[PDB]
Amino acid sequence: SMTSRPKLRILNVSNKGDRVVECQLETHNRKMVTFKFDLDGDNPEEIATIMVNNDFILAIERESFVDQVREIIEKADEMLSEDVSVEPE
């Protein structure tokens, strides 16, 4: 299948109540697009639909966009994970 890889940068990860990633996309008609998602509440495919509908990524960029956002969510979740106790109380 024909594919293209959109260029994404992580700008910020926040862990102050909700866990939120701010990312930046670079567009083909030369417009920068910043977007934010919640680690716990948002899904990479849902974010991809918003981006395709608004012409911020191409249909041939959807698969790569989802794969990248899924990897960012995994890495951020591992970075923010903490020790936990099981209470037999």
Side-chain angles (χ1 to χ4, degrees), residues 1-29 31-89:
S1 58
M2 187 198 182
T3 61
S4 175
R5 180 179 166 84
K7 173 60 196 168
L8 307 187
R9 186 176 159 82
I10 294 170
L11 296 180
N12 199 83
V13 183
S14 185
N15 186 35
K16 295 183 199 186
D18 295 317
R19 309 192 304 159
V20 181
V21 180
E22 186 186 37
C23 286
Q24 194 161 69
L25 175 73
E26 189 169 1
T27 278
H28 290 281
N29 287 333
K31 189 220 287 295
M32 278 266 224
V33 176
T34 297
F35 63 100
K36 290 183 161 190
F37 47 96
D38 190 295
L39 288 182
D40 298 302
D42 287 322
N43 181 282
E45 285 279 12
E46 290 163 355
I47 301 166
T49 285
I50 290 160
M51 300 296 278
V52 170
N53 282 344
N54 283 285
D55 303 282
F56 293 148
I57 59 166
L58 307 179
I60 59 166
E61 291 171 326
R62 188 191 186 101
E63 181 177 273
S64 179
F65 183 90
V66 169
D67 286 345
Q68 293 185 63
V69 177
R70 195 173 273 142
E71 188 163 307
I72 290 169
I73 284 172
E74 299 176 5
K75 292 180 182 178
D77 175 68
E78 288 187 21
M79 178 182 76
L80 298 177
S81 61
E82 303 176 15
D83 295 356
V84 68
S85 307
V86 192
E87 96 170 325
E89 296 192 30

